[model samples]
Target: DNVTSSQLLSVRHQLAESAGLPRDQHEFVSSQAPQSLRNRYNNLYSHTQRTLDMADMQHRYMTGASGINPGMLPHENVDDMRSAITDWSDMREALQHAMGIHADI
Candidate 1:
């Protein structure tokens, strides 16, 4: 079933409450990473997610989906793609050395 973000969020609160987790689970702090590192990771994660999301949406538009009449489907910019990839690569390196990931991109 395709669940809307709102629907999932509502369910998340119910589930978290049942499990005794906080209502605003997303805002909870972790002792794992410093606040700065957390923010960096979150920014990169958002970039990665949105990249895939935009790709899927763009693919649909380019192929046969109804958006604008003849879409410029597959409008991929590899240069832009490298930024997220490099972030993940740097993250992997940092983790190997037990360091927090940061944006040097």
Candidate 2:
């Protein structure tokens, strides 16, 4: 199943806040594109967003903390750190792939 619209909206809000982007900026970017290009961008954005959410969830599961501190090692457990890093790397790769596609457009 796909991620819920509410979840996607929450992610979008987090992204806008984190990047210091205005709400209309996202709408402008999406609206200015041609339909096909907009669709492509939306797909890429959604994939990247989901990957990032998963990564954040994984980090929280490992660290048992909240907020966006991916590299914050709460404990001295090497294996836990390693697993978190691996999850982060996977998310990064997925995001990079999305960016690559975006750049080509």
Candidate 3:
């Protein structure tokens, strides 16, 4: 399949470039692509947005302690930290696989 190798690779490259862009710029890039490319780009874009949301939640929770050097906060336990890290890594793994632009071709 022609779409499997060179053409798809290039399109996926551009999608990666646009992945971390701000909303306006990202959509603008998506608008210029053909609908097929645009569809995959937007899929990655939405996944990127959701990952950022999780990162933001983790950031706030991790830093929600009262003092500068606060130790042993309720929400900052080792088990919770390990769990959150695992969850983050799993989500990232899914995102990376999605970047491969698999199936339904």
Candidate 4:
């Protein structure tokens, strides 16, 4: 199932908790950050989530009987699926680089 609003909110809450900020405080921090930085952060998070969602959807579509042709494998259309994966990876990398999170294991 697609992620619900509550699920997203829970994620936001977890994020705030992990950052040692209350939800409202986290919001304030984001709001007070430089516009360029805030936008970049938002873009990276959004793109990363979207890419993961798309990949999950692609996996479902490929494995289930709902969309696949009888003889075709999902990877046969790898180019299209890979494009989104690549985009996701790029966005994640950009986010990590910006946050100096490269050393994270």
Q: Which candidate, 2 or 4, would have the higher lDDT against the true structure?
A: 4
| Model 1 lDDT, residue 33, Cα | 46
For this target, which candidate reaches the highest TM-score against the unseen true structure? 1
lDDT of 1 at 89: 62
Q: For residue 56, what is the lDDT in candidate 4?
A: 31
Give lDDT tens digits, candidate 3, residues 8-58: 233333433444544543344455445665565546445544333322232
- Per-prediction TM-score to the true structure, in the order listed: 0.48, 0.32, 0.31, 0.33
Considering only N, C-alpha and C atoms within 3 Å, which residue pairs clash in candidate 3?
A: none
Clashing pairs in 2: none
List candidate 4 segments past 4 Å from native: 1-25, 58-105
Candidate 1: misplaced stretches above 4 Å? Answer: 1-30, 61-64, 67-73, 99-105
By TM-score, the candidates rank as 1, 4, 2, 3
- Tens-place lDDT per residue, model 1, 76-103, is 3222345566775665555434433344
* Count of residue pairs whose backbone atoms collide, per candidate: 0, 0, 0, 0
**C-alpha local distance difference test of each model:** 0.44, 0.41, 0.39, 0.42
Q: Between the candidate structures 1 and 3, which one is better when assessed by lDDT?
A: 1
> Could you tell which candidate, 1 or 2, scores higher by TM-score?
1
Task: Estimate the overall C-alpha local distance difference test score of candidate 3.
Answer: 0.39
Q: Output the TM-score of candidate 1.
A: 0.48
For model 3 the TM-score comes to 0.31
Worst 10 residues of 2 by lDDT: 72-81
